[PDB]
Design a protein around this nucleic acid. Structure first.
Ligand SMILES: Nc1ncnc2c1ncn2[C@@H]1O[C@H](COP(=O)(O)OP(=O)(O)OP(O)(O)=S)[C@@H](O)[C@H]1O
Lengths: 549, 295, 152, 443
DNA sequence: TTTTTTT
């Protein structure tokens, strides 16, 4: 088909004047940002192409091969009319997008093992006819074959990688066995997946020529399974004051109340800062959440909300049913390796063995676990651990203490920062509100798309610091809290937690400076939380928590 | 542009005082605008990070044409000047400006009332290291000061951003007034010259202009020795648009207020623009400064 | 020492010390052939060399001969045809002599006829011989020029 | 005899170019050899030439003609091995940096070394290598493994003058206890024992069939929250060679290695005590550890003699290590409220085979508590404790200085006790053994 | 035909 010559003029009538939601040429506004970042990639939604001119959708399923070769070069010249000197960067931008041959296919799967990255010839130049032959094209997975021979020099290369992909164990019909298929990577997509993931790729489907037919999928657009005005309109809203209670009010509308423990969980995933001193040492960068449950609670529903909204979350089972959080060479990183700079979800400590005790022990303290294995490396782990426990026998035994109530030991609790505890007592109106909001559940807060851009945009950018004039009250708080709780029995790590929790409130305002309000909220959340763990004789502690305010 | 020959063009603009306010480098808006200038230059980010010595010859020869073809977009058209460059041959050429900045940086680093006088003695002690530094052949010591100049400019622009977030400026009609009562790395602020260039770095930043009515800035800091709070005078900088013989104001005002009760005031500073004052007494000093305003 | 043995302390006679370990198998090798022709009623003579025996780079002369000149049957003979045994062993240096902390590294030395099966794996042996390097070092058709030691 | 010298100087964009870089050494190879100058011979006509070569990384090979014509063809050339010249070759392999971008498994490359660069660095250092990122082909899809040829490796008299100056000051012991843990207040007895561990005692080569042991051992059993963890990390950073281990269970760190496989050969890979022969071993979680190869550790610190009698090898090797412990008793601070033993469930013979045993307590002192509070707030914020630069101007100018000093200190002095001091220790061991008699026989 | 696991 030679008509694509004339179609190249008209395919830019879609590129730079795609008027949707009052004009807004997302492609034309995007190109200046593409060459701005030198990403050498342009994204094309199948919705927009199907919406404007579906003749190209036919040109996708029938001939996806040469259509890209015609589309990317015109995108190159269409970008160079915008940037006069962009050809000095890369000068080539590749684009993104039996009944299966010669078509683009939306494919799912799980990443099996793979290989390294090698360069591959792109330009082929060739003693028979005097001098060299001339430039020729390096076919993909095929030779040129124009006596002469290819020389070592004068060869422009291209990085290559092939990726094995096998079927996803999640949508397997139950009991059958998975099968395999080949995926080959190209330039900007070099080594994008990682073992232990799922993936959704947009591939063109080919087959081998002859052997002396195996099919190979070359892939175009990798998307993982689930702009300028987008962050500035975002900043027009983020300037307000009452976002504190609103975050908890926008955190989890399924169960309506419980603002305190919901604010603590919302603070946990929002992160802390380890703040490595220049040359000296790094302290700790995570917030530790324990939530002592009760049968008869939808506390698990909360952590499921945590897993869908947050970045990397692998649900760690109750007892050995899964992944195992400790990487080990078996016939290879653990799930904690997947959750780097993310939040892990580990629960039901009552039924977890010592393997988990060592992994969780070292990971929340100083991030790295070593062995008595024939390889010696130090892989760290910056996970964030959120637990959900269960009381022994009764949900709450008596006035007897928390350490007497729980079956764990003291140092594992020491690794923990916050202790949110729920209570079960017969309230008539709470049951009324509960049943009525349940009815509403079967029928002002931030929409979930804005909050996900909020936490992702915040954790990559907001970097809290602190001044030296406001921590003296805090020093007095630690001094009275430790020195007065001597008669009670205490955590020095909770001293570091003060700054590491309070820094998140400055992360909430994206102000980079810790106001007094942040310290006051951090004190009013930590102190009373420690208060709630005692006996009925806590009245005295209630009568000394005034000076605390 | 500053620190041209010994540093990356990226850091050169990043720490550039002239480029600072126009591009609003402290804020995130101009960040992309800076990369946009490089996108006009067609320079890879990694190419900008390399040392000036190892950058390609093409990039060298074409630098000025590229500047002529790109920077004008941001109003930078009047920059290129025919300034002199020394040829010492084999160790490489340097514009007089850069060597000046390095030597003055060598002046400020690279080193009851008895401690303050002891420190004053140490300032004079650092002068001979500079007088010795004036020779061409003694390069060993010179490179240390050359690099420490970068360490200063880093701290300057950093604390500068910190001041930009709190907006402690009192935009008054008479004159702008500010004070830094607390902050990290206050030891470097002991030298008056630190605050001289610091004030200059602010003065051009807050007002480009940015019409109208350029106003003087007030600045002070203290750590020990009972609220020394050196306050040095500062004057507005015009962006080429000596239009008038304005010069200064403060000498007469200092004579008027120092002629009053003047308790604990010390005129010990050789330069008339800077004076030591107690904060307790600096507040009324300000009150008397506002009114009667001599200007 | 084997640690500083390569490149220099090369193509000379080297005194090596170390431990006898992993003794290989005993195979005999043919050198001088005796062949009888039926009609002439005479004997004959033919030799063959390899890189272990000559110590000098000579043209190798390998196929077992029959029907050379006229058509006389070259019946080979035995007994009078000579043979020499052959063996190769590895000697790593003494482990206490090693650097700060490492796995000791080693080379090998080839013996000859009257010295076959004199070292069992596991003894203390001083060795005097000549450092011989054989083989086409990758110029045959990727790191070659494998080594051994002779004249022992 | 004078060969040609070698000069030593110091992705799609990186193929075969002048690039400097930096990484960590994964594993080296055994000193190998390519050839440099060589003469060939025609086996029939006796025709000889000679070729010198430099770039041993394909370009040219032996011809197949007698060359006297310029039919003996094909290739008649036989390499004269008695009149050749050779050099050495190393073949390192490097591993990525553990602080940045492992967001994965560690990746690696292949190195190759030339003439005077051989046998230079034992693995474990953090180094920089200037290189050439070139491509080779060996083991229709054009799969080629890339590599970096090494040119100019750089490592990790007047100093003797300042060393002698620092040796004779009588305040050296304290100024070193102002050098180890600036981030940690208190714990000064531990802070002192680290000073003695980084130097190492005497080493006796007696007519006796054994030699004795020199380096020492550090224990930190005690209550949690002490940050003894930060202390053991900084111990690893100070010594030039040392192995830090956090517990019995890793992601990737092993401990006599048994490797069985290409060419069907058994070979010895390594481990952890092997890297730390003559260094510091840090073991965290002394009670969270298994009894699977613990015996090697029950011997490595006492007789320095690891035996291997497996399927591959039958050697007795050396291990000059020093182990540093950091335990936790059961139930935290209550272990001292019952009988004062009740800590190691197996027995006390391992502790008898250690050197120093310290117990960390936790007593409230409000001034100490406020001081440890604001001391740590000053550590986090406002860089108050971080004043150190004037302290550098007055005490302990650097950590790397301390390292260079220990390197100079270990092999130079030959310490030994003094005869007038020996009778003091002889009279003192009596008092300690009597002390144990008092606490034991009457109880 | 031998090295890391787990019921
Ligand atoms: N002066 C300090 N004292 C105690 N902890 C500190 C101090 N400064 C910072 N820290 C931090 O507080 C944490 C307290 O835990 P550790 O002191 O490691 O307790 P632990 O006794 O090591 O528990 P382990 O490691 O399982 S034995 C440290 O890991 C540091 O992150």
């Amino acid at each position: 088909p030679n008509v694509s010559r004339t179609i190249a003029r008209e395919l830019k009538s879609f590129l730079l004047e795609y008027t949707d939601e009052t004009g807004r040429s997302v492609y034309g506004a995007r190109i200046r940002t593409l060459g701005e970042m030198n990403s050498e990639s342009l994204e094309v939604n199948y919705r927009h192409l199907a919406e404007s001119k579906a003749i190209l959708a036919l040109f996708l399923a029938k001939c996806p091969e040469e259509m890209l070769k015609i589309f990317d070069l015109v995108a190159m010249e269409a970008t160079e009319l915008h940037y006069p000197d962009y050809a000095r960067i890369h000068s080539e931008i590749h684009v993104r997008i039996e009944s299966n041959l010669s078509s683009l296919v939306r494919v799912t799967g799980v990443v099996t093992r793979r290989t390294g990255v090698f360069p591959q010839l792109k330009y082929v130049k060739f003693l028979k006819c005097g001098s060299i032959l001339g430039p020729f094209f390096q076919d993909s997975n095929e030779e040129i074959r124009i006596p002469f021979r290819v020389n070592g020099e004068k060869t422009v290369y291209r990085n290559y990688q092939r990726v094995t992909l096998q079927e996803a164990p999640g949508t397997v019909p139950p009991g059958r066995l998975p099968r395999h298929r080949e995926v080959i990577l190209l330039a900007d997509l070099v080594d994008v997946s990682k073992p232990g993931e799922e993936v959704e790729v947009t591939g063109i489907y080919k087959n081998n020529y002859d052997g002396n037919f195996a099919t190979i999928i070359e892939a175009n657009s990798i998307k993982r399974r689930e702009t300028e005005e987008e962050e500035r309109e975002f900043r027009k809203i983020s300037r307000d004051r009452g976002i504190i209670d609103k975050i908890i009010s926008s955190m989890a509308p399924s169960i309506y109340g419980h603002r305190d423990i919901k604010t603590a969980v919302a603070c946990s995933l929002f992160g802390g800062v380890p703040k490595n001193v220049n040359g000296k040492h790094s302290i700790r960068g995570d917030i530790n959440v324990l939530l002592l449950g009760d049968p008869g609670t939808a506390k698990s529903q909360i952590l499921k909300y945590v897993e869908k909204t947050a970045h990397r979350a692998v649900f760690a089972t109750g007892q050995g049913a899964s992944v195992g959080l400790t990487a080990s060479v078996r016939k290879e990183g653990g799930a904690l390796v997947l959750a780097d700079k993310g939040v892990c979800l580990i629960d039901e400590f009552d039924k977890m063995n010592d393997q988990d005790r060592t992994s969780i022990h070292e990971a929340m303290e100083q991030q790295s676990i070593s062995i008595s294995k024939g390889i010696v490396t130090t892989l760290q782990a910056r996970c964030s651990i959120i637990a959900a426990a269960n009381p022994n026998g009764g949900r709450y035994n008596s006035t007897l203490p928390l350490a007497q109530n729980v079956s764990l030991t003291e140092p594992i609790l020491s690794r923990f920062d916050i202790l949110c505890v729920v209570r079960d007592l017969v309230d008539e109106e709470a049951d009324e509100r509960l049943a009525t909001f349940v009815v509403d559940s079967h029928v002002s807060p931030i929409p979930q798309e804005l909050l996900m851009k909020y936490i992702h945009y915040a954790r990559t950018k907001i970097y809290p610091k602190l001044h030296q004039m406001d921590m003296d009250k805090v020093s007095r708080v630690y001094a009275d809290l430790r020195r007065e709780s001597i008669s009670t029995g205490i955590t020095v790590r909770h001293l570091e937690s003060i700054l590491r929790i309070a820094e998140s409130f400055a992360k909430m305002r994206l102000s980079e400076f810790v106001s007094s309000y942040d310290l006051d909220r951090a004190i009013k959340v930590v102190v009373d939380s420690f208060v709630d763990a005692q006996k009925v004789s806590v009245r005295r502690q209630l009568r000394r928590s005034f000076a605390i305010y | 542009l500053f620190l041209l020959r010994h540093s990356s063009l990226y850091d050169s603009f990043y720490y550039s005082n002239y480029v600072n306010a126009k591009l609003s480098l402290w804020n995130e808006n101009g960040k992309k605008r800076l990369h946009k200038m490089f996108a006009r230059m067609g320079i890879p980010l990694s190419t900008a990070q390399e040392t000036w010595l190892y950058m390609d010859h093409s990039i060298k020869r074409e630098l000025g044409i590229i500047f002529d073809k790109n920077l004008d977009r941001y109003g930078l058209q009047d920059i290129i000047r025919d300034g002199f460059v020394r040829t010492l041959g084999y160790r490489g050429s340097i514009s007089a400006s850069e060597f000046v900045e390095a030597l003055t940086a060598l002046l400020e680093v690279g080193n009851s009332a008895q401690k303050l006088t002891n420190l004053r003695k140490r300032w004079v002690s650092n002068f001979w290291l500079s007088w010795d530094a004036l020779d061409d052949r003694k390069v060993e010591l010179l490179n240390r000061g050359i690099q420490l100049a970068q360490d200063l400019q880093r701290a300057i622009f950093n604390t500068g951003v910190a001041i930009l977030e709190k907006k402690l400026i009192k935009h008054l009609r008479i004159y702008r007034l500010c004070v830094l009562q607390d902050g990290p790395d206050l030891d470097l602020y002991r030298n008056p010259l630190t605050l001289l260039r610091l004030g200059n770095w602010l003065i051009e930043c807050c007002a480009e202009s940015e019409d109208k009515q350029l106003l003087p800035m007030v600045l002070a800091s203290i750590d020990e020795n009972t609220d020394t709070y050196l306050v040095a005078g500062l004057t507005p900088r015009y962006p080429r648009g000596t239009k008038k013989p304005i010069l200064n104001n403060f000498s007469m005002a200092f004579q008027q207020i120092t002629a009053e009760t003047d308790a604990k005031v010390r005129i010990d500073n050789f330069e008339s623009s800077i004076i030591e004052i107690r904060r307790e007494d600096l507040s009324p000093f300000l009150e008397k400064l506002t009114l009667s305003g001599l200007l | 020492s084997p640690r500083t043995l390569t490149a220099q302390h090369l193509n000379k006679l080297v005194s090596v010390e170390g431990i006898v370990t992993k003794t290989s198998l005993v195979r005999p090798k043919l050198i001088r052939s005796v062949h009888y022709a039926a009609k002439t009623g005479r004997f004959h003579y033919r030799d063959y060399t390899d890189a272990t025996t000559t110590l000098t780079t000579r043209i190798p002369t390998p196929i077992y001969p029959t029907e050379d000149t006229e058509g006389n049957k070259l019946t080979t003979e035995y007994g009078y045809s000579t043979f020499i045994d052959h063996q190769r062993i590895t000697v790593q240096e003494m482990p206490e002599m090693a650097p700060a902390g490492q796995l000791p590294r080693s080379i090998d030395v080839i013996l000859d006829d009257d010295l076959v099966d004199k070292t069992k794996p596991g003894d203390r042996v001083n060795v005097v011989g000549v450092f011989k390097s054989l083989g086409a070092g990758g110029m045959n058709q990727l790191i070659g020029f494998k080594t051994l030691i002779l004249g022992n | 005899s004078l060969p040609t010298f070698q000069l030593i100087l110091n992705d799609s964009e990186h193929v075969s170019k002048i690039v400097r870089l930096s990484g960590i050494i994964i594993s080296t190879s055994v000193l190998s050899s390519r050839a440099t100058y060589l003469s060939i011979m025609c086996r029939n006509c006796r025709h000889t030439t000679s070729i010198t070569i430099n770039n041993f990384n394909n370009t040219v090979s032996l011809p197949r003609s007698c060359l006297s014509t310029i039919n003996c063809g094909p290739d008649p050339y036989i390499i004269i091995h008695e009149s050749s010249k050779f050099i050495d070759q190393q073949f390192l392999k490097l591993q990525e940096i553990p602080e940045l971008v492992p967001v994965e498994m560690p990746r690696n490359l292949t190195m190759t070394c030339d003439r005077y660069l051989t046998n230079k660095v034992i693995p474990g250092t953090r180094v920089t290598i200037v290189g050439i990122y070139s491509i080779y082909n060996s083991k229709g899809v054009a799969i080629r493994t890339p590599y970096i040829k090494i040119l100019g490796i750089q490592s990790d008299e007047e100093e003797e003058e300042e060393f002698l100056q620092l040796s004779r000051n009588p305040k050296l012991y304290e100024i070193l206890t102002n050098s180890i843990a600036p981030s940690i207040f208190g714990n000064e007895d531990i802070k002192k024992a680290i000073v003695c561990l980084l130097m190492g005692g005497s080493k006796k080569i007696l007519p006796d069939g054994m030699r004795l042991r020199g380096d020492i051992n550090v224990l930190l059993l005690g209550d949690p929250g002490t940050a003894k963890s930060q202390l053991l990390k900084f111990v690893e950073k100070v010594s030039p060679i040392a192995v830090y281990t956090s517990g019995k269970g890793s992601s990737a760190a092993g401990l006599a290695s048994v490797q069985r496989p290409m060419t069907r050969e058994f070979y010895l890979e390594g481990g952890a005590m092997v890297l730390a022969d003559g260094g510091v071993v840090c073991i965290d979680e002394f009670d969270k550890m298994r009894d699977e190869d613990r015996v090697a550790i029950h011997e490595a610190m006492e007789q320095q003699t690891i035996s291997i009698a497996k399927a591959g090898i039958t050697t007795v090797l050396n291990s000059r290590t020093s182990v540093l412990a950091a335990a936790n008793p059961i139930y935290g601070r209550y272990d001292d409220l019952k009988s004062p033993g009740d800590n190691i469930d197996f027995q006390t013979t391992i502790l008898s085979r250690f050197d120093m045993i310290f117990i960390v307590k936790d007593d409230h002192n409000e001034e100490r508590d406020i001081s440890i509070a604001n001391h740590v707030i000053n550590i986090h914020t406002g860089n108050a404790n971080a004043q150190n630069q004037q302290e550098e101007n007055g005490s302990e100018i650097s950590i790397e200085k301390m390292k260079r000093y220990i390197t100079y200190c270990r092999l130079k002095c030959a310490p030994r006790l003094s005869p007038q001091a020996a009778e003091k220790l002889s009279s003192n061991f009596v008092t300690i053994r009597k002390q144990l008699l008092i606490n034991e026989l009457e109880s």
